[PDB]
Amino acid sequence: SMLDDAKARLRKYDIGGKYSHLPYNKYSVLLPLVAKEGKLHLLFTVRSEKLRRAPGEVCFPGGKRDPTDMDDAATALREAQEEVGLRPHQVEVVCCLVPCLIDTDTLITPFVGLIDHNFQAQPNPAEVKDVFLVPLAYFLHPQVHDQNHIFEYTNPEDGVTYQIKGMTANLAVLVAFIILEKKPT
Numbered sequence: 001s002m003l004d005d006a007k008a009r010l011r012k013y014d015i016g017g018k019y020s021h022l023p024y025n026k027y028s029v030l031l032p033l034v035a036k037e038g039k040l041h042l043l044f045t046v047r048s049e050k051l052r053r054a055p056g057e058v059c060f061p062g063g064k065r066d067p068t069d070m071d072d073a074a075t076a077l078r079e080a081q082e083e084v085g086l087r088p089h090q091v092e093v094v095c096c097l098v099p100c101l102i103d104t105d106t107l108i109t110p111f112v113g114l115i116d117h118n119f120q121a122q123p124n125p126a127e128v129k130d131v132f133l134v135p136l137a138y139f140l141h142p143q144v145h146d147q148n149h150i151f152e153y154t155n156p157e158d159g160v161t162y163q164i165k166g167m168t169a170n171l172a173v174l175v176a177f178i179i180l181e182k183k184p185t
């Protein structure tokens, strides 16, 4: 099936816990995959204008690990619940992709998660201004704008344009390559 094929592809890139004990300031992100209309989509948030770091920007759900988290996957799931109401039974964590190093002392670990078809986002307005889907295939032929390369995605439901950039854009491309490369039609 489409979903069984996605997970099998993703598993080949799972680094697991290889890098998880290293003594960094640790954050985790969830790359949430949603199946709609026969196709895979990624779910993105728009960060609240209130927030200190990067108000109003497109981001994946996630945040800083805390002492309650059993592991890095737990951080991602705790934060996704807080931000968009995603509950643990509504997500299967399929793998841990390549961690992102920033600022010399910070390590951000990305987890890809398959989201239940009945999940409906409840944006928490103190953290998240908006939630939207992008078809995964968009990231193979994005509308590129230079400001370094920025993606512009216009939701055909409502005509709203979102800008996706930086590691958010990078991770999205990675996931699209993993799952969609070399597929019969």
Ligand SMILES: C=CC(=O)N1CCC[C@@H]1c1cccc(CC(=O)Nc2cccc(Cl)c2)c1
Pocket (backbone or CB within 6 Å): 027, 028, 029, 045, 046, 047, 048, 051, 058, 059, 060, 061, 062, 063, 064, 083, 100, 108, 127, 128, 167, 168, 171
């Ligand atoms: C910054 C954009 C991005 O997607 N990436 C992936 C790698 C780098 C960066 C990131 C750094 C550190 C935490 C996070 C995840 C987070 O903080 N989400 C978030 C969303 C919406 C409300 C809130 Cl409160 C948080 C992400």
